[PDB]
Amino acid sequence: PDLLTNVAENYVNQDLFAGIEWRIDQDGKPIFQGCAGVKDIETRTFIPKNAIYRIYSMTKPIVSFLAMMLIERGVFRLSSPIQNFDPRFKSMKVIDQHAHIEPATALITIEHLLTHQAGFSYDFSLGCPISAHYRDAQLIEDGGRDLTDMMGVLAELPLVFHPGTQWKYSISTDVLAHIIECATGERVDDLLQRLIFDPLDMQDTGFSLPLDGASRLMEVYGMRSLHGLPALKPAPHVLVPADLGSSHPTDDPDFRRGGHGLYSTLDDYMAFANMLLSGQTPEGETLLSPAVLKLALAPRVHFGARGMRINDEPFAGYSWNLLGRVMTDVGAAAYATHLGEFGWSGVAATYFWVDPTKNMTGCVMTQFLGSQHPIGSDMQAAAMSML
Amino acid sequence: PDLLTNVAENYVNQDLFAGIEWRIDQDGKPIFQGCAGVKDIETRTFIPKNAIYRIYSMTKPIVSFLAMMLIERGVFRLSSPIQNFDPRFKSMKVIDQHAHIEPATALITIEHLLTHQAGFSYDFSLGCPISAHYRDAQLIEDGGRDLTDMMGVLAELPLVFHPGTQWKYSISTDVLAHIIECATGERVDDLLQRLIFDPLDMQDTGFSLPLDGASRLMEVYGMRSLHGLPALKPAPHVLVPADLGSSHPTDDPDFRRGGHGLYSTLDDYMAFANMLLSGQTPEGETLLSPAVLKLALAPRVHFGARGMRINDEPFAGYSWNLLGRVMTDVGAAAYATHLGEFGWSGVAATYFWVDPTKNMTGCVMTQFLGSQHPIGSDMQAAAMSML
Amino acid sequence: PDLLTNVAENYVNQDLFAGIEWRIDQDGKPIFQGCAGVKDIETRTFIPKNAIYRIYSMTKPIVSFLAMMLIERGVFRLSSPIQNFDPRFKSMKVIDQHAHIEPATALITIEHLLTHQAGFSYDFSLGCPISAHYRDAQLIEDGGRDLTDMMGVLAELPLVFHPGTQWKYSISTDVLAHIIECATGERVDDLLQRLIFDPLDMQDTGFSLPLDGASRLMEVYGMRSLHGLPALKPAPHVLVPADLGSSHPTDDPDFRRGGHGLYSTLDDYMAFANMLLSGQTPEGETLLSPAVLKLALAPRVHFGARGMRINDEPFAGYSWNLLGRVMTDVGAAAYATHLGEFGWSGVAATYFWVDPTKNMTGCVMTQFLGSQHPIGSDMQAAAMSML
Ligand SMILES: CCOC(=O)[C@@H](C)c1cccc(C(=O)c2ccccc2)c1
Ligand SMILES: CCOC(=O)[C@@H](C)c1cccc(C(=O)c2ccccc2)c1
Ligand SMILES: CCOC(=O)[C@@H](C)c1cccc(C(=O)c2ccccc2)c1
């Protein structure tokens, strides 16, 4: 039975998601694919050809992969202190939950940024000692502010632990994008275009819409908390269009970020995921060598009893590598997977995975902010069960 | 020599405080007293007779003393669960710095409120997992909100540790004032009037100015942070009149709190401090029996090597009793004192102490919010050096 | 692209290294090789044919390999107490950072020497409880002193931990060379010649220059700290010829050491590295059996959270075996590698590796003391990326 269709259709029929697309490839070619629902429930327009999604933190594996290419090319290395490229990050301080502030005892490195061990936090982090000051500064909300300028504001705030000593999912991929710009003298969006998107023919992926993109953009549903104040409990899961404020412009030619902000399509993201099986384009051009791809995918952050968590949500059986999650214990996993399955996901419920043991990739595209329902993992589980 | 005058005149002559009054009594009679500076630097009006000060958390020993009287009279007991008097405090939750929320595993008691071990926080607590939600609710800022209603809003928010398991200086004295009202059916300001202020002849003490009070109210100086966002470093110490917003009304007949909000005078507060040497009025009427006064003053919360801290500011060598600080190790103390010295202080730099070994009481009144200079401790040390 | 050339040329063009040679072999034959820069910037003489390098601690894997040959031949064993061969090492003492001295509670063994777990330190060790006494004794500086005589002076000084209980990179390979002499009745340089260099046709490797060697010796650049006092921060990385004092003679026929002092060439060192893939010469003569080579290469010292460090510089993902470093966690590694990659390096920035998973060896020869730039690891990473 087509478990993937059953999951997606049940989600649409229960009024939980407006529209869903999915594709699963094996050996670089589609084996399962489908769509359910509509572009938007207001007009019930069908999902268009080459529909466009805000992929939020599925931007991070792309920007991280770019960083690995630059490491391979000698621009910087994992151990490089970021203050060597932007001195505004010299002399960081660390704050704790008891109001105590002290100088950081270790320099932030490229590796710390890629592993979320740098001590940064995030505006929406509930209970965080510093996230109120991120929100006051509007680091995420003010999407119109140039990346270079956002970093200057961020650099003045304290970290929430000494670099290297803990893990916390964070704005550090945005720092990484900025440090890439400092190190190369180029803009991160131009680098992504030349080094990744153009070689993989990802012609619909970028920080602004294509000229014909407005009619292809999927509507985004959900509730963003008033003033950005982190919610103490989930809002009701209701299909109401979300207000993104100025956080996610569609046609700002200077908007670029490391941790979110890309628009993409199912087809484009599958080209990226399939490349991660080998480090090569389908024509055989190498984007990253096998040795550095192995360095990027090896489990690098290991977690204690409570496991990997983001705002206390678990990622059971997962460790962290330089690009995102990686399954390191199927016996601890909460849904079907295989050892070494890796990938990431975004807050509008987009999700992808790469499963080297099956030469398999998969991606689910939808637009629902802060879903109470783990559609991405449900679709991965369905696809795993259908092999 | 008169070190007390020297300290006070130096502070005034360095443009650090506008006006200061102090008195030190021994055996219930004044032994040192003085005044320095002016009511306000704008007009340089002289400090009036019976000048009036916002005493902020010097409200807490008074409200705590009232609670001990009510315990003595059988209204409730230290072990009483506060949910027995207001069921809005049933089913509390606890939040941590990792965004994890769970049910409280102990009920909040009267003793927890008096010792700041209930798990409540404070709006201005820097780095606190929940203070951002206090600020969003304007618990402290909205002084026009009735105490009973402010408590309903607070009760819906999580604690930051399980009741009884830690110490954190907090809004719990306001909860105590509210629970007093629940338990007695009377208002806390009326109970304070009948049980404490009138027997001690504290005719100028209350939550609103006396009829002839506006001309005697000292000006308040200092910088309250924008939006109440807790500052990451001290603001420059400058004598600029402070803007209190709607947090501290002068003529609201329903304004009443437990942790702040009283107006008082040097002479009134000394009457209260002298009473704490015996539990008796000067006429010999008992406000609190010797046994319950001993219960209230005995060291009750003991601190680790980090010591007692508020927003990471230390109270070196102090433990906590049911009314405030108490000196338990002169060899750890950071300024002159004796074993058993007790008292408290307020954010506008008012300060008092009681020293049973010398039958001594002292009080410094001034108005500077968030002083970088610990005038209260400096004046205590001067008085200790003189006796 | 030729990443190796790009790295080397960038280092020369940025005035960071005078001259660099490299070679990478696979299956015993060169696959990548090159050179950049000059022998010396003063005259800009090109790097000569068979250029000679001071290889410093790349002496250690050679002397360690010699020790394994002697273990195989029954001269001594890993568990042999060194005091059995030189009684000046009976009755060692241990000093700590609190000035406390006590007798060592374990005897130093051959294995302790090969693993730097014997408790010795090094003259240049910053912050070390005993390195000031090494410097006073001029153990490293006085290169004219006979090895046998240096050992007598060293033997009178305390260790910095009990043998076997910790790891600290040390003068212990020099102790090993001396104990080899005691055990065999032969000089270490004669043993190296007969057992290793002559079988591998390493005709330019030794503790003094060949008769035609003076014109082939690469100039050495960098700053040695005045009086040998360990620096608190890196000196500026500037190409100024280094003053080696009497630490590294070119034509002393009795100069021999275990931890440094060899002159070699790229070609000679690659013959040694290639032999470590098999324990055999290219003609198939066995220098060390497969079983004892496996014993020598197996990870033997494992490190805690802070990892393997020398003067606080990290070797991320590396453990220690009887010959040097060995990669035991690619997920912790700071630059491209494979599980089981091993080798060592020297303070003038020479570096080599052996990668059994690729049947690969590599060596970078240059002369810069105390480089701020990890040229050896950069070149390894480049070569790994080019496979
Ligand atoms: C996957 C990428 O998520 C992010 O990193 C940032 C960019 C982000 C940006 C804008 C809006 C949100 C939320 O709507 C939200 C966050 C937390 C809880 C509920 C909703 C999150
Ligand atoms: C001593 C009693 O002050 C308190 O602890 C609480 C009751 C309180 C209540 C109302 C206003 C403020 C401030 O204005 C303020 C707090 C922190 C920094 C600067 C200003 C504080
Ligand atoms: C790899 C072999 O390093 C050694 O074991 C010893 C022989 C050594 C001998 C002579 C000079 C130096 C330094 O120049 C130096 C040491 C520490 C920091 C900066 C410079 C080191």
GROMACS .gro file of N, CA, C and O in nm, chain A residues 72-73 77-79 111 289-292 294-295 298-300 302, chain C residues 3 11 329-336 338 374 378 384-385 387:
model
  128
   72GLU      N    1   3.777   2.292   0.205
   72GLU     CA    2   3.851   2.209   0.110
   72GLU      C    3   3.944   2.295   0.025
   72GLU      O    4   4.058   2.255  -0.003
   73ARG      N    5   3.898   2.414  -0.013
   73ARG     CA    6   3.973   2.505  -0.100
   73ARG      C    7   4.071   2.591  -0.022
   73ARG      O    8   4.138   2.675  -0.082
   77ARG      N    9   3.978   2.695   0.805
   77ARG     CA   10   3.973   2.556   0.851
   77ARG      C   11   3.884   2.547   0.975
   77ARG      O   12   3.840   2.648   1.031
   78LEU      N   13   3.849   2.424   1.012
   78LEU     CA   14   3.756   2.403   1.123
   78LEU      C   15   3.804   2.474   1.249
   78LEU      O   16   3.725   2.527   1.327
   79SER      N   17   3.935   2.477   1.269
   79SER     CA   18   3.989   2.536   1.391
   79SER      C   19   4.008   2.687   1.382
   79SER      O   20   4.052   2.748   1.480
  111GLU      N   21   3.441   2.545   1.340
  111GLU     CA   22   3.380   2.420   1.383
  111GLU      C   23   3.269   2.445   1.485
  111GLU      O   24   3.161   2.382   1.478
  289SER      N   25   3.513   1.665  -0.205
  289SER     CA   26   3.580   1.536  -0.216
  289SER      C   27   3.520   1.432  -0.121
  289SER      O   28   3.455   1.466  -0.021
  290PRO      N   29   3.541   1.304  -0.151
  290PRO     CA   30   3.489   1.201  -0.058
  290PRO      C   31   3.546   1.214   0.083
  290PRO      O   32   3.474   1.193   0.182
  291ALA      N   33   3.673   1.251   0.095
  291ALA     CA   34   3.733   1.261   0.228
  291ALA      C   35   3.669   1.373   0.309
  291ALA      O   36   3.648   1.358   0.431
  292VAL      N   37   3.641   1.488   0.246
  292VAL     CA   38   3.585   1.599   0.324
  292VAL      C   39   3.435   1.577   0.345
  292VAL      O   40   3.381   1.613   0.450
  294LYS      N   41   3.313   1.280   0.406
  294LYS     CA   42   3.314   1.191   0.523
  294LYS      C   43   3.339   1.270   0.652
  294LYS      O   44   3.277   1.243   0.755
  295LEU      N   45   3.430   1.368   0.647
  295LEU     CA   46   3.456   1.453   0.764
  295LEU      C   47   3.330   1.529   0.804
  295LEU      O   48   3.298   1.542   0.924
  298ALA      N   49   3.055   1.259   0.954
  298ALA     CA   50   3.086   1.176   1.070
  298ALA      C   51   3.018   1.232   1.194
  298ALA      O   52   3.015   1.355   1.214
  299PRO      N   53   2.963   1.147   1.282
  299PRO     CA   54   2.902   1.202   1.405
  299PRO      C   55   3.006   1.276   1.488
  299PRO      O   56   3.112   1.224   1.520
  300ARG      N   57   2.971   1.400   1.525
  300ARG     CA   58   3.065   1.493   1.585
  300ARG      C   59   3.023   1.544   1.722
  300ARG      O   60   3.110   1.570   1.808
  302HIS      N   61   2.787   1.429   2.048
  302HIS     CA   62   2.714   1.319   2.106
  302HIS      C   63   2.639   1.371   2.228
  302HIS      O   64   2.686   1.463   2.295
  777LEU      N   65   4.542   2.125  -0.529
  777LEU     CA   66   4.523   2.197  -0.403
  777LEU      C   67   4.654   2.210  -0.327
  777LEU      O   68   4.676   2.311  -0.257
  785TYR      N   69   5.140   3.004   0.089
  785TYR     CA   70   5.229   3.022   0.203
  785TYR      C   71   5.357   3.096   0.164
  785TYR      O   72   5.403   3.182   0.240
 1103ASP      N   73   3.906   0.898   1.566
 1103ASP     CA   74   3.766   0.942   1.552
 1103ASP      C   75   3.762   1.052   1.446
 1103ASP      O   76   3.786   1.169   1.478
 1104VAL      N   77   3.728   1.015   1.322
 1104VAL     CA   78   3.717   1.114   1.215
 1104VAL      C   79   3.613   1.220   1.248
 1104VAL      O   80   3.627   1.338   1.211
 1105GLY      N   81   3.508   1.183   1.323
 1105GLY     CA   82   3.409   1.278   1.368
 1105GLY      C   83   3.458   1.382   1.466
 1105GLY      O   84   3.388   1.480   1.490
 1106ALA      N   85   3.575   1.361   1.527
 1106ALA     CA   86   3.635   1.463   1.611
 1106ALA      C   87   3.750   1.536   1.540
 1106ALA      O   88   3.799   1.637   1.592
 1107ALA      N   89   3.791   1.489   1.423
 1107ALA     CA   90   3.910   1.542   1.356
 1107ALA      C   91   3.886   1.684   1.306
 1107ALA      O   92   3.773   1.721   1.270
 1108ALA      N   93   3.994   1.765   1.305
 1108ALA     CA   94   3.990   1.906   1.265
 1108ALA      C   95   4.032   1.927   1.120
 1108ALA      O   96   4.028   2.041   1.070
 1109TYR      N   97   4.072   1.820   1.051
 1109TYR     CA   98   4.110   1.830   0.911
 1109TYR      C   99   4.105   1.691   0.849
 1109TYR      O  100   4.109   1.590   0.919
 1110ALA      N  101   4.094   1.689   0.717
 1110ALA     CA  102   4.067   1.565   0.646
 1110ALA      C  103   4.169   1.457   0.677
 1110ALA      O  104   4.290   1.484   0.683
 1112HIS      N  105   4.160   0.979   0.763
 1112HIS     CA  106   4.083   0.855   0.769
 1112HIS      C  107   4.118   0.781   0.897
 1112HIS      O  108   4.227   0.796   0.952
 1148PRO      N  109   4.934   2.598   1.047
 1148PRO     CA  110   4.955   2.452   1.049
 1148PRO      C  111   4.976   2.397   0.909
 1148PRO      O  112   4.890   2.331   0.853
 1152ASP      N  113   4.745   2.141   0.674
 1152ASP     CA  114   4.684   2.195   0.553
 1152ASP      C  115   4.722   2.113   0.430
 1152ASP      O  116   4.641   2.094   0.338
 1158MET      N  117   4.443   1.466   0.088
 1158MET     CA  118   4.325   1.382   0.108
 1158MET      C  119   4.213   1.421   0.012
 1158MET      O  120   4.141   1.335  -0.041
 1159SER      N  121   4.195   1.552  -0.008
 1159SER     CA  122   4.088   1.602  -0.093
 1159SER      C  123   4.115   1.571  -0.239
 1159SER      O  124   4.021   1.572  -0.319
 1161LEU      N  125   4.244   1.285  -0.358
 1161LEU     CA  126   4.221   1.144  -0.393
 1161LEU      C  127   4.079   1.117  -0.444
 1161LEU      O  128   3.985   1.191  -0.413
   0.00000   0.00000   0.00000
